Amino acid sequence: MKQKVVSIGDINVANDLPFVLFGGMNVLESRDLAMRICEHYVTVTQKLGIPYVFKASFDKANRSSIHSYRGPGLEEGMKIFQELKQTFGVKIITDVHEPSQAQPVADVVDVIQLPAFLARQTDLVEAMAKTGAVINVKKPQFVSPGQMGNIVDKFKEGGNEKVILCDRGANFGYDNLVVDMLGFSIMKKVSGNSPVIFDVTHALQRAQVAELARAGMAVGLAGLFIEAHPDPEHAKCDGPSALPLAKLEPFLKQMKAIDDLVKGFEELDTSK
Amino acid sequence: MKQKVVSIGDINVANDLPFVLFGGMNVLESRDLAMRICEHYVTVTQKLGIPYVFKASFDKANRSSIHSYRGPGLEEGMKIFQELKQTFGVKIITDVHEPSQAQPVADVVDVIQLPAFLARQTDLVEAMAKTGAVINVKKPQFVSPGQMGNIVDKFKEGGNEKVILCDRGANFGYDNLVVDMLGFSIMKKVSGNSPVIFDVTHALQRAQVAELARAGMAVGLAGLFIEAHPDPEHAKCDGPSALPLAKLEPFLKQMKAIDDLVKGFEELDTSK
Amino acid sequence: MKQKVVSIGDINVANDLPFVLFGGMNVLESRDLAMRICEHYVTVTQKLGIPYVFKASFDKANRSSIHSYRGPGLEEGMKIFQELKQTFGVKIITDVHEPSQAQPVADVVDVIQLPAFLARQTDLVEAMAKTGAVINVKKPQFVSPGQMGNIVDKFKEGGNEKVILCDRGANFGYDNLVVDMLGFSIMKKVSGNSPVIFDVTHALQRAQVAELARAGMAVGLAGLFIEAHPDPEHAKCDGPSALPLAKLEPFLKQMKAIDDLVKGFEELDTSK
Amino acid sequence: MKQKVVSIGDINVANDLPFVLFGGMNVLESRDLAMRICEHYVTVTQKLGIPYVFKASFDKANRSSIHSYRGPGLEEGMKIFQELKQTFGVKIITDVHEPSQAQPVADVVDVIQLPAFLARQTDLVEAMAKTGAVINVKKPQFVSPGQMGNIVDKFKEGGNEKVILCDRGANFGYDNLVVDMLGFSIMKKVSGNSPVIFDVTHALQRAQVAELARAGMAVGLAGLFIEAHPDPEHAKCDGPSALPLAKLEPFLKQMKAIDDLVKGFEELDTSK
Ligand SMILES: O=C(O)[C@@]1(O)C[C@@H](O)[C@@H](O)[C@@H]([C@H](O)COP(=O)(O)O)O1
Ligand SMILES: O=C(O)[C@@]1(O)C[C@@H](O)[C@@H](O)[C@@H]([C@H](O)COP(=O)(O)O)O1
Ligand SMILES: O=C(O)[C@@]1(O)C[C@@H](O)[C@@H](O)[C@@H]([C@H](O)COP(=O)(O)O)O1
Ligand SMILES: O=C(O)[C@@]1(O)C[C@@H](O)[C@@H](O)[C@@H]([C@H](O)COP(=O)(O)O)O1
């Protein structure tokens, strides 16, 4: 039973391969900040030996109040990714919201992303399926792991067969998320063993980021999705919960130690 | 403490007023069927004395497989509502999916509707807010009743202040829904007491439709949302679960008996 | 399909019969209070025409701190029920905790009760099964409605076949309960259609008691379990949540109106 | 912030110390089997360098049908532990059900255990508190991690201050459990940092035992509770789910690798 491999350039994403890191920032506040963020990851990844795909949103459709920060915009956001690609030579992953946006971004970026709230949006899927680019399907919090087959299916049909599945927890009563560590294996199975990744920061709507990321890693995964900010405190708002830049490295040491140890275990069968 | 009233033409929707019925069919399969469905409700409502707003989808974006029935289409769907309005003189409620669709439909119909998966879609909201038409916000299964304030808010700002909230249950573990009968009062409160309605057929993803609708009604509500099909059996698929046309009346008798009895109770305070 | 009838003296408990009320107080604080409580229910029931079975605990095993009020005791509690029986001529229902207590109480009372935390306690069940007295099995919050067959089974074997099932909600995330109005029918079915009753006050760990009891009643049930206190405010603590004595009647009017209306509906089949 | 240490003989249980293993069998079917089970763990633990406390039930109160295997009995069960202690020189942990049983077992065994269904049983707690022996409080599936303070409290009062907390997952909808990897830290905090252990086999009511135990371990814990059977297949029934004896070692290698790596990480603070 070998794992499906979805490559992003010279990068090979797969469940038995060492874990890739799709780290980054939430939104593209400004390039002076993007660059500073994207500067530390690269430095840290490069130094620790971990694949990496910077991530950032150039848009935000679920914000409260219309009189709020939508974001840079598709036309001004893509421009920002350009400069980073050159200056740093790393891949960029970003999410889209409308069917049309799909192709524009596909050119500019390496891994596009499908939002959870829109996971079941056939039109936007088919249109993201056209691009042929790599996809990251965030697993909705209201959907069971064994239902991720349909999404992957609908994508094969659209001609796209390069998909990654991202988990960010499941609803646990009102206003709360719990991560079912058992969902990863269920997702690998029904997904022709596509690559599974854990969005730890979004599964925590704290000093919890670490313990929870350790647990995810010990299961053995293809990737780890995260977000950080130089100053989480003052810039705290809501949505996810970012990691403190200055703790990137010491935290990523924890992951590799795990991911490496685990990724190299003699296959076990507690089945019989 | 009086209830907010949102009128749809000569119709006054409100939590203390007698319940309105936003019944109908799931999708607009064909007019030969739409008309037959819309024929029985009208006949039954009219005969039993219950307000009514036919409902039907001219589109479907969450279907499995691209090679599937999208639906009539916006351009050919609106045409269908025209003929029904004339032939029957009843209001039409239908859902939209993209920001642009909003105005087109607003002209053609009386009550537009915001899908749950898109409840938090600011752009589509602002654009639905423009129309100024009545709105029905389906309460996502992954959102708590006391969070329906933000949606109603984002709509006031968009200039729209004619909103109804629809509940279709909450996630209960994997692949399952439970209706928190307590969510209705929580929703009335944080909603400036806007009208609350129960989507019974969508809260049941059976011979259960009735018992569950009774319970909802006994709480005292503004409306009741439902769907029926002449032959549920053979045309069964998935999504919701339709009621059997031939049982409309005897089932709606149950509701009025409840809604009427309850809607006329001396306000009670178990508070103290 | 007729309902199973479990009689408690001249009382006939059954799902299609008018609803019985197993009201009362939480614990037996003092007789000066018990009597006052038991005085108002009787007066109200008798005046409104509703069967009734006073209820009270002579013991409490889940209290915090050993240095707390256990309760009157089995030996001094039973004495209290005696005086009430005479003075008022009503039935008494109370819960037991240890295998031995079963018989003692069976003599003194009419309906014994099995605590949820102990629902799966075979020894205490078999011993409660011996008595042959009527039983009330509180449905644990961590057990699904369709699992109530085993308990009823284990009781038939013990020779006891006079059982009532009581529902007090289900776990909904951390520290929270939701009542699945659909659980009642599932419980009737797997229970040879035994009598199902709704413990509204324990399903609410407020001004919510009413709306929630209405919903339960509209489903159509055998009974309604509740608790009240003269002054809920000052004597508030935790466990359940009692109703305000002075609101008993106006609240029970709500129930009969429902229970009566519903209990006399032409059987409906939304099944086909 | 140092961890509380609860010693069981020459054994020191604590959250920062290497993990102890409280492995064993479910019930005491027969000594010819107990001994064979207890033979392999010891051999494996001893060879791998992991503390160990054989575990087995001499009783079963939640079985279906009275006409079923209760178990050896308290009087004939304790006798079995005697022979194992001598023959193998390992500690024995077993659960009690009635207040009286407490002392008898305390003499015979090292770590007694409080069942979840009885976690909130004040009498049985106070009586288990008397013994003064080490306690293992299984965390009920219907209780939140931050409520484990009360139990630990009620035990201090009873004079007992040597307690371990065991987690076996939380209710996730009907008939299902999910393990909230975040519950361990919440439990350490409100417990004066008492020792936390993960009951993996009971959190799985499969080939899942491993992945789930890895995740638990990566969080960093005091212990690991498990059960195994020579032939899980044919002797499969219900309650928990046992591990396959022949896979003990290769599975415990996985744990130590984790527990060791993790237990020796430079304290991290993703807090700021
Ligand atoms: O907190 C997050 O995980 C994140 O920042 C990561 C982004 O890559 C993206 O998935 C985003 C989110 O949900 C995208 O848009 P939405 O699903 O309509 O709110 O959340
Ligand atoms: O089963 C339903 O309740 C229904 O037929 C009613 C429609 O009015 C509409 O709310 C529809 C649904 O969810 C709209 O589209 P989607 O939320 O993206 O799947 O479901
Ligand atoms: O609040 C309650 O519903 C009540 O007062 C009713 C009593 O009849 C009894 O069921 C009691 C309870 O749980 C009995 O004891 P325990 O289950 O071990 O806490 O709760
Ligand atoms: O599957 C289990 O984890 C186990 O075998 C372990 C035993 O140590 C004990 O905790 C037992 C259980 O629940 C004790 O009795 P009960 O809580 O009344 O069913 O379950």
Structure characteristics:
homotetramer, 272 residues, alpha/beta, TIM Barrel, 5-stranded parallel sheet, 8 helices, 15 strands, globular, binds ligand DO8
Question: Could you explain the architecture of this structure?
Answer:
- 4 copies of one chain form a homotetramer.
- By secondary structure, the first copy, chain A, is α/β, with parallel strands linked by helices.
- Chain A has one domain: Aldolase class I (TIM Barrel).
- In chain A, about 35% of the residues lie in helices and about 15% in strands.
- Chain A is built from 8 helices and 15 strands.
- The first copy, chain A, has a 5-stranded parallel β-sheet. The first copy, chain A, has a two-stranded antiparallel sheet with strand order 1-2. A two-stranded parallel sheet of chain A has the order 4-5.
- In chain A, a hairpin with a 2-residue loop joins strand 1 and strand 2.
- Chains in contact: A-B, A-C, A-D, B-C, B-D, C-D.
- Chains A, B, C, D: It holds the Pfam family DAHP_synth_1.
- Chains A, B, C, D: It catalyses: D-arabinose 5-phosphate + phosphoenolpyruvate + H2O = 3-deoxy-alpha-D-manno-2-octulosonate-8-phosphate + phosphate.
- Chains A, B, C, D: InterPro entries: Aldolase_TIM, DAHP1/KDSA, KDO8P_synthase.
- Chains A, B, C, D: Keywords: Cytoplasm, Lipopolysaccharide biosynthesis, Transferase.
- Chains A, B, C, D: Its EC number is 2.5.1.55.
